[PDB]
Structure 1
Amino acid sequence: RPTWLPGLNPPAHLKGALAGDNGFDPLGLGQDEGRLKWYAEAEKTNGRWAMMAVAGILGQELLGVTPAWWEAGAKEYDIPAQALTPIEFIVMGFLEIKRYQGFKQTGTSGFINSFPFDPAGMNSPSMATKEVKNGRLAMVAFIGFCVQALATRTQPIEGLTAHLADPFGKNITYYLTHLPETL
């Protein structure tokens, strides 16, 4: 298999039976057979949430929303945040309690009661690799979003256009310095 390092043999606990196996476990956390079963679903869930997260950020800024994505919590909606938090907790607790009970049995993902969800016929191991890989991409890209706007900085696509305006003057080396000019 193509590994994360050239010439590197993949470890013994990472056989190429799972989805996104590139032999990347330099720490050795996937050496328990049950903790790896949890970490797989944790990867998929963090990645799905980060997928819809970067989708939501890029879609919020592609459309004409008022604030930035980081300023979106401090905003006046129809329902106050002190009232939105518990409703969110009730709904998402329903969804995630039903999701766990459904990972206990049948050991795979799902929405509420259909495990797996898959209304359409698009389940394939190739599609599993797609999901996990675009999800890892989404997680790292969301962390990039967060730290790319770590102060009152540019929004993602705005920062993309700013990097494309001057590649050798608008980069990590410019914004790690000149930080007063940003704030």
Structure 2
Amino acid sequence: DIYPEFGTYPGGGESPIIPFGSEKNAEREVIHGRWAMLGVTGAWAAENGTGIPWFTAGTLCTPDDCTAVADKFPGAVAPLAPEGSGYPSFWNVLIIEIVLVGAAEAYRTGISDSPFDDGLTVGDVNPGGRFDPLGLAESGDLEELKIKELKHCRLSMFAWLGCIFQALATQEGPIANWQSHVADPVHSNVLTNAAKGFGFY
């Protein structure tokens, strides 16, 4: 069996708890997983590198101050910024964020015409035409690789939901919570935190 766990891939199955409904729901699922995966690994890396929890990283960069981000990146040869000048600013990045992500979005979904105009079809999660220069889509069992990615997608989203609920309850951070649990698993758990209260009880 390809998918021995509880649920099954959309292509074949029944979706036991929630009905399958639209196929756009499956499109969203994959995209949510492909995103949350990047989010979870980014929160992991930010906690490991800087010790700053992900959920307050936005406090760092603000309209008045967005210079602190420059010195955070570990092992960089020169800063992010022009040193004292600190050209990077919240708005400086924001205009860049909105234009670049909006272009990437729209050329993905087909709100605007595809610039690549290379036969790629919008509304498919797996293009496999240009976004795989390495050819791992072409080679190997492509369907099995869709399965693995899906599994990683669902795991990462569930871990993301865990991360947000741990940020709400513990207020410490994902990796800080991981270190607390590993240092002592018996007396550092969700139920131990509930016994102590989540800061509200």
What runs of 5+ residues in structure 2 fail to find an aligned partner?
A: 68-87, 115-119
Query: How far off its partner does 1:46 sit?
Result: 0.6
- Under a length normalisation based on structure 1, what TM-score does the superposition of the two structures give? 0.73
For the pair 1:55 / 2:34, whether they are aligned, the reply is no
1:166 alignment counterpart: 184
User: Which residues of 2 match residues 13-24 of structure 1 at below 5 A?
Assistant: 18=11, 23-24=14-15
CA separation in 1, counterparts of 2:51 and 2:183? Answer: 24
Amino acid across the alignment from 1:77: C
Amino acid across the alignment from 1:135: C
Amino acid across the alignment from 2:102: G
CA separation in 2, counterparts of 1:25 and 1:41? Answer: 18
Paired residues, number: 163
- Under a length normalisation based on structure 2, what TM-score does the superposition of the two structures give? 0.67
2:158 alignment counterpart: 140
CA separation in 2, counterparts of 1:77 and 1:66? Answer: 18
Q: 1:91 aligns with which of 100, 114, 127?
A: 100
For the pair 1:109 / 2:125, whether they are aligned, the reply is yes
Amino acid across the alignment from 2:136: M
2:25 alignment counterpart: 39
For the pair 1:131 / 2:149, whether they are aligned, the reply is yes
2:171 alignment counterpart: 153
CA separation in 1, counterparts of 2:152 and 2:126? Answer: 19
User: Would the aligned equivalents of 2:40 and 2:159 in 1 still touch at CA under 8 Å?
Assistant: yes
Query: How far off its partner does 1:128 sit?
Result: 0.4
Q: Deviations for 1:95-137, whole angstroms, at most 9, x for unmatched residues?
A: 01000126x93642368xx755211121211110011110110
C-alpha spacing 1:127/1:48, structure 2 compared with 1 (3 Å): same
1:13 alignment counterpart: none
C-alpha spacing 1:71/1:143, structure 2 compared with 1 (3 Å): same
Query: How far off its partner does 1:66 sit?
Result: 5.4
Identical counterparts, % of pairs: 28
CA RMSD of the aligned region, Å? 3.1
Which structure has more relative contact order (CA 8 Å, sep 6+)? It is: 2
User: Would the aligned equivalents of 1:54 and 1:138 in 2 still touch at CA under 8 Å?
Assistant: yes
C-alpha spacing 1:175/1:53, structure 2 compared with 1 (3 Å): same
